[PDB]
Amino acid sequence: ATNYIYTPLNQLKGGTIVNVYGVVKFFKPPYLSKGTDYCSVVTIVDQTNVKLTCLLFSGNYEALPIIYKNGDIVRFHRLKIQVYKKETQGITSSGFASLTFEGTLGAPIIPRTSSKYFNFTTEDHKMVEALRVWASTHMSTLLKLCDVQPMQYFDLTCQLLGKAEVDGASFLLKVWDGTRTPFPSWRVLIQDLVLEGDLSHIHRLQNLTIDILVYDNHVHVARSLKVGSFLRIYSLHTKLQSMNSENQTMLSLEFHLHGGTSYGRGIRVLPESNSDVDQLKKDLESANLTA
DNA sequence: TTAGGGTTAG
């Protein structure tokens, strides 16, 4: 007899293990913590409008919620509820499992999860649709490089073209999205044999590519990325450079992925089954012809 | 256990 009960977020009590549905208001993509497992922080909200911050840990990266953007809808099974500093918080419990869905009205309802076996009923369809209806109104779009501003944080959907070690504390990712930034990208000094990727393709693209420097904890992740894959770089930071190291006046746009995980700073590889990747590929094809 | 959301400051 399989009957799952979902608890409204405003009815959660400490010292319990529950099942919940919610819309993602904020999230830190999976990152190897200072401990044993990978960690993902997800703040969800539902019709009760009560927010719940969930601390999710797992030895396997894919076991954590497959969330690609705020607004996504999640279903959490075996979520433990506890109190931390008078604040109720959700944390992973043994057997924790999640399903993630697109959060926009009319979008396909395709559960994303690493679980081989999982319960999925008509009730789940209704639950998801109900959250999309609520979200369309109680709460809430992809920025192209040609539209970035001088100094801001943003999430960049792009394709990785090249990788290059720099100084251990930082690592270079050369990416593109098919559009050109308003000011030329800065260019990190690279070495001779260090940059991996199609050098001639990169050279022909000229300023269609940008240099992103990632720091600290982001380095080993960047080091593992496969050239040619599609990525979403969260909370990338743009900074215009009007004065160079030799004290000369100029203009270049710097791109930094600063150390730490605050505000979701991180990188998640986007599979080709991702609808944003389909659109990106077309922009890349178009840019490739006129260049 | 990790982390406990809230931007490096290169």
Swiss-Prot record:
GO cellular component: chromosome, telomeric region; nuclear telomere cap complex; nucleoplasm; shelterin complex
Keyword tRNA processing among UniProt keywords: no
Effect of substituting Y84C: In TPDS3; complete abolition of POT1-DNA complex formation, thus disrupting the interaction with telomeres and leading to elongated telomeres
Cellular compartments annotated: Nucleus; Chromosome, Telomere
GO terms of molecular function: 8-hydroxy-2'-deoxyguanosine DNA binding; DEAD/H-box RNA helicase binding; G-rich single-stranded DNA binding; G-rich strand telomeric DNA binding; single-stranded telomeric DNA binding; telomerase inhibitor activity; telomeric D-loop binding; telomeric DNA binding
Keyword annotations: Chromosome, Disease variant, DNA-binding, Nucleus, Telomere
Residue ranges, annotated region (DNA-binding): 28-43, 262-265
Site (DNA-binding): S235
Subunit structure comment from the entry: Homodimer or homooligomer. Component of the shelterin complex (telosome) composed of TERF1, TERF2, TINF2, TERF2IP, ACD and POT1. Binds single-stranded telomeric DNA as a monomer. Associated component of the telomerase holoenzyme complex. Found in a complex with TERF1, TINF2 and TNKS1. Interacts with TNKS1. Forms heterodimers with ACD. Identified in a complex with ACD and single-stranded telomeric DNA.
Family in the record: Belongs to the telombin family.
Disease in which the protein is involved: Tumor predisposition syndrome 3: An autosomal dominant disorder characterized by an increased risk for the development of various types of benign and malignant neoplasms throughout life, with age-dependent penetrance. Affected individuals can develop neoplasms involving epithelial, mesenchymal, and neuronal tissues, as well as lymphoid and myeloid cancers. The disorder is associated with elongated telomeres. Cerebroretinal microangiopathy with calcifications and cysts 3: An autosomal recessive disorder characterized by intrauterine growth retardation, retinal exudates, global developmental delay, neurologic regression, intracranial calcifications, and leukoencephalopathy.
Protein name: Protection of telomeres protein 1
The encoding gene: POT1
